[PDB]
Amino acid sequence: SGFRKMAFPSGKVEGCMVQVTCGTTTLNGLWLDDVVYCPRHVICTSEDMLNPNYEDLLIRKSNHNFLVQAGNVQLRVIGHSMQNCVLKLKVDTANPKTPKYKFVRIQPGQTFSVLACYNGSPSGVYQCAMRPNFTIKGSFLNGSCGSVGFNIDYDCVSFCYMHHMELPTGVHAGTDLEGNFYGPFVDRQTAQAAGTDTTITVNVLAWLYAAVINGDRWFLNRFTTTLNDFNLVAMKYNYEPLTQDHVDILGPLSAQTGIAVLDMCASLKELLQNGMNGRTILGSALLEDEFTPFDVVRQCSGVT
Amino acid sequence: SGFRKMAFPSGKVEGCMVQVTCGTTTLNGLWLDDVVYCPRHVICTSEDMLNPNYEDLLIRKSNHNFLVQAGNVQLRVIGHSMQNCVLKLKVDTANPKTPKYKFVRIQPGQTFSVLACYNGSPSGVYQCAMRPNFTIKGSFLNGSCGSVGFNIDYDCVSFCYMHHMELPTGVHAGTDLEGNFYGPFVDRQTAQAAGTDTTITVNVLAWLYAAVINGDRWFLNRFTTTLNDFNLVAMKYNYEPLTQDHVDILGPLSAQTGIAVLDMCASLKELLQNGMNGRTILGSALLEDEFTPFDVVRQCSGVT
Numbered sequence: 162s163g164f165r166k167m168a169f170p171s172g173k174v175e176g177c178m179v180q181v182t183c184g185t186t187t188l189n190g191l192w193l194d195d196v197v198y199c200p201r202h203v204i205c206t207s208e209d210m211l212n213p214n215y216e217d218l219l220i221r222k223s224n225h226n227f228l229v230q231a232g233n234v235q236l237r238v239i240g241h242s243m244q245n246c247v248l249k250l251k252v253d254t255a256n257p258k259t260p261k262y263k264f265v266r267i268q269p270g271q272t273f274s275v276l277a278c279y280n281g282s283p284s285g286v287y288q289c290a291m292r293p294n295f296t297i298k299g300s301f302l303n304g305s306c307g308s309v310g311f312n313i314d315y316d317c318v319s320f321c322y323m324h325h326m327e328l329p330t331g332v333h334a335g336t337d338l339e340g341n342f343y344g345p346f347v348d349r350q351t352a353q354a355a356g357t358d359t360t361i362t363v364n365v366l367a368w369l370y371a372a373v374i375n376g377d378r379w380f381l382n383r384f385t386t387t388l389n390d391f392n393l394v395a396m397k398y399n400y401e402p403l404t405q406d407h408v409d410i411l412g413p414l415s416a417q418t419g420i421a422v423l424d425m426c427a428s429l430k431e432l433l434q435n436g437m438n439g440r441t442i443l444g445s446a447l448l449e450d451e452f453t454p455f456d457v458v459r460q461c462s463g464v465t
Numbered sequence: 466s467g468f469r470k471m472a473f474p475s476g477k478v479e480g481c482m483v484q485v486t487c488g489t490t491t492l493n494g495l496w497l498d499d500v501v502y503c504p505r506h507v508i509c510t511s512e513d514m515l516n517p518n519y520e521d522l523l524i525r526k527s528n529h530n531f532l533v534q535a536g537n538v539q540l541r542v543i544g545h546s547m548q549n550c551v552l553k554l555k556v557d558t559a560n561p562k563t564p565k566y567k568f569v570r571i572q573p574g575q576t577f578s579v580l581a582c583y584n585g586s587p588s589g590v591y592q593c594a595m596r597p598n599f600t601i602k603g604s605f606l607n608g609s610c611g612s613v614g615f616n617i618d619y620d621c622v623s624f625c626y627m628h629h630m631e632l633p634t635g636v637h638a639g640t641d642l643e644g645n646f647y648g649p650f651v652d653r654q655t656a657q658a659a660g661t662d663t664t665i666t667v668n669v670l671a672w673l674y675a676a677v678i679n680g681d682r683w684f685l686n687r688f689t690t691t692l693n694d695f696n697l698v699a700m701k702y703n704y705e706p707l708t709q710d711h712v713d714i715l716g717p718l719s720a721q722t723g724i725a726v727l728d729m730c731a732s733l734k735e736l737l738q739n740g741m742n743g744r745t746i747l748g749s750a751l752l753e754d755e756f757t758p759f760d761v762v763r764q765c766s767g768v769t
């Protein structure tokens with residue numbers, strides 16, 4: 162029993178973190194097989210970051226300008242290329258700790274673990290969600306760029322995020338491992354405002370199911386609703402619209418608890434309209450939206 | 466910027482987890498050097514757990530009855546002994562992945578990371594605190610016993626917790642790695658009620674400092690207080706008394722922010738008396754108490 166904001170075990174990813182230095186800029190790289198992946202802004206001075214021309218800045222860089230250190234041993238760079246907003250540094254040594262891995266581009270509302278790193282060294286692991294506005298709410302100081310986000314399926318690491326940027330509002334933006342930003346953001350020190358940070362409704366419902374499974378039931382009421390009725394309330398409260406696809410995804414949690422998805426929607430509707438009245442659910446005073454239905458099943462069933 | 470409930474990177478501990486089976490009971494063990502540490506209740510049937518005599522149950526057990534599996538390779542048990550509530554299984558192979566480590570018995574209010582495991586396989590990592598009533602609020606299903614709690618100082622893992630028990634109230638109890646329970650709990654399926662789960666005041670203040678550092682400042686007020694005045698309010702709200710030792714520990718955060726500890730106490734006093742009025746601090750609608758002053762400094766300074 163008990164329900165925690167749980168990250169994947171980080172060991173498989175710790176074995177992939179390296180330091181990348183280009184001139185006076187140091188950040189993190191990801192070493193998989195004989196390629197090191199890092200943010201292309203490693204080539205920028207802080208001055209460069211106001212309006213960088215990355216292709217032009219890269220012409221001035223040779224393999225020997227990219228210093229890659231794995232622990233306290235230097236890797237030899239034998240090639241480099243830019244793919245979107247990431248550099249791929251080809252090294253002469255395959256990472257012997259390379260796990261089974263994939264690169265995945267996640268959808269908003271999907272959760273992942275972040276291994277926060279500085280100078281190629283892991284500092285901490287925490288659980289994030291891709292927000293509906295394609296930001297994440299992370300914990301990143303200067304030096305953390307190139308820290309990655311991932312999911313694990315048994316022994317396969319799916320890398321979904323590389324840290325690039327903090328917006329002036331202190332939320333975070335980054336890329337998939339093909340170097341494509343999530344959302345509209347660019348690797349430039351310019352005005353970039355995030356859109357509405359809407360609540361991930363299907364995740365809230367998942368977490369209400371987790372609450373019921375773990376004995377927190379006070380919020381269950383005598384009501385039901387319809388998708389259309391619920392969605393009028395969702396809109397009013399800056400919740401994402403609930404689709405039949407979301408209802409389908411919650412089917413296993415509905416089955417386990419015997420609470421129809423639309424009944425849990427009516428419970429959520431009353432919580433939105435009434436608030437918590439000073440009560441808590443799974444030790445939270447607000448409705449938690451960074452657990453997916455898959456996260457709730459995994460944690461409630463003990464998948465390794 | 467940003468402030469997250471962050472666990473230590475789990476790799477060093479993942480390399481120590483093994484499966485221990487005794488008859489039909491399987492749980493987790495910790496393999497350090499040539500010793501495997503596990504809960505002594507591995508020797509119990511569920512029937513045994515109502516009123517176990519561990520010394521008597523252990524007489525019926527030989528080295529060959531303790532099946533220890535590290536991945537998919539069996540370890541040879543060449544000795545076994547009971548130390549308090551843990552068994553120490555001597556194996557013929559030193560764990561080649563043994564990190565630098567220590568065994569520490571933590572005090573209430575101290576935080577640590579838990580690597581939740583099943584059948585010797587890591588499932589997840591999360592951050593806990595030792596509650597003032599010597600329970601922890603974990604996420605543990607059947608099979609998770611022998612999962613451990615730890616802190617890391619650079620390359621030294623300090624193990625502070627091994628999971629043994631879920632109370633009928635769904636909170637968790639366990640031992641240090643010498644097998645001594647935290648608090649009054651015993652490894653027996655009997656009535657065990659936890660005492661008052663008081664709020665860890667020094668940790669709340671640390672987290673208010675973290676909030677100010679990360680730009681959440683709405684709760685800062687024009688007031689100060691005294692330790693005695695604050696403590697009258699703490700008592701009323703089931704907060705731990707604040708001591709000068711706690712004020713001393715918060716000194717670095719006071720210095721960094723320029724907010725006197727007693728001024729932050731007066732801000733906390735008003736939050737206790739007024740509530741949040743529907744506002745949030747670092748994305749929380751309640752006052753968070755599972756960050757220590759050391760955690761706030763570490764996370765805010767990027768220690769690896």
Ligand SMILES: N#Cc1ccc(CNC(=O)N2CCOCC2)cc1
Pocket residue numbers: 202210302303325326327347348349350351
């Ligand atoms: N992609 C990207 C990218 C965009 C803007 C910048 C500007 N620098 C910045 O925000 N840092 C934050 C931490 O402290 C030092 C300066 C850097 C990288």
Ligand SMILES: N#Cc1ccc(CNC(=O)N2CCOCC2)cc1
Pocket residue numbers: 506514606607629630631651652653654655
């Ligand atoms: N130390 C200890 C200890 C105390 C009581 C028990 C009784 N079993 C129990 O609570 N589990 C919970 C999970 O589902 C199956 C039964 C076991 C170990």
